[PDB]
DNA sequence: GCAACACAAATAC
DNA sequence: GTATTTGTGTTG
């Protein structure tokens, strides 16, 4: 009823069928290791700006909750959260040296304001888009909102047993604990070690994440998630990284700056989840139904 | 179909 | 021991 998989940091991911067996909503055995993603496409190259050196750039992605592999599938459940965490690496640069240098596309060259990671949910057989709906804890007490495009700087992943261990932390000394974890104060760093120019002092704020963290995400309520034949659709979850740029024939987004003027975020690279199912809220879907 | 409302069980403190 | 968080039962 329960296959266990070691994780890479020795925590398990324990993959039940909720058609067969309820578990606790508060169960460790709800958090687990989701699909590997996998490379999409790269996009549009960056150099670094006197150096001429290309950023080699990698997403770094992983789903810790709302998935299990079952009968050689991958299944979530409408109803229910899903966690999508992401960071991404240059694997030829510092973090310190990074922050300090600026960075343009090289399209014949727009700079670079920051970096920066999106989510998106698609029907994988037709690429349409899927709206994804995310809550805070308070759930239908507080407001619903939709992902976010997240401004980011270079970081490790952090394991599976972390993004557990923070996903509910209220406590003000606990949230210190993870606080460097997450974040870079832009506002704590030696303004005098930093030219005008840097990557660093164009992120739009002071509080800048190191790791992209959607949690307590749904696909939307109103999605169909079997096709006419009750053949069952093929859901895939992209993470795209990006690089915002200043506008005054390439893929970008268009993003509403900080000083209110459209900007674009400019696609580097994109990965993607294999094919998902998504069960939906019908009863035989639950084991209260047998 | 689905929003809103309900119950319940383990975590966080 | 209390409040919170979240899977999932029920309603109309």
Known sequence: ????????????????????????????LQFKVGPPFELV?????????????????????????????????????????????????????????????????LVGRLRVQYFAIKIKAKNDDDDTEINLVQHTAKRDKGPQFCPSVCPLVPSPLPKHQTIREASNVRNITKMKKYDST????????????????????????????????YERVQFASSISVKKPSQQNKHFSLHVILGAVVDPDGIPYDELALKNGSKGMFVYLQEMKTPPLIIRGRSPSNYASSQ
């Open 1 to 28: 009823v329960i296959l266990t998989q070691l994780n890479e940091d020795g925590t398990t991911s324990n993959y039940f069928d909720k058609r067969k067996l309820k578990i606790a909503p508060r169960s460790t």
């Open 41 to 105: 496409r790269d996009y549009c190259p960056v150099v670094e700006s006197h150096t001429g050196r290309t950023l080699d750039l990698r997403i770094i992605p992983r789903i810790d909750r709302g998935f299990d592999h079952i009968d050689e599938e991958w299944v979530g459940y409408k109803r229910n959260y899903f966690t999508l965490v992401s960071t991404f690496e240059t694997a030829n640069c510092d973090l310190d040296t990074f922050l300090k240098s600026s960075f343009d596309l």
């Open 182 to 213: 997450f974040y870079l104060h832009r506002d704590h760093v030696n303004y005098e070690e930093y030219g005008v120019d840097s990557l660093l002092f164009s992120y739009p704020e002071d509080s800048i994440q190191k790791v992209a963290r």
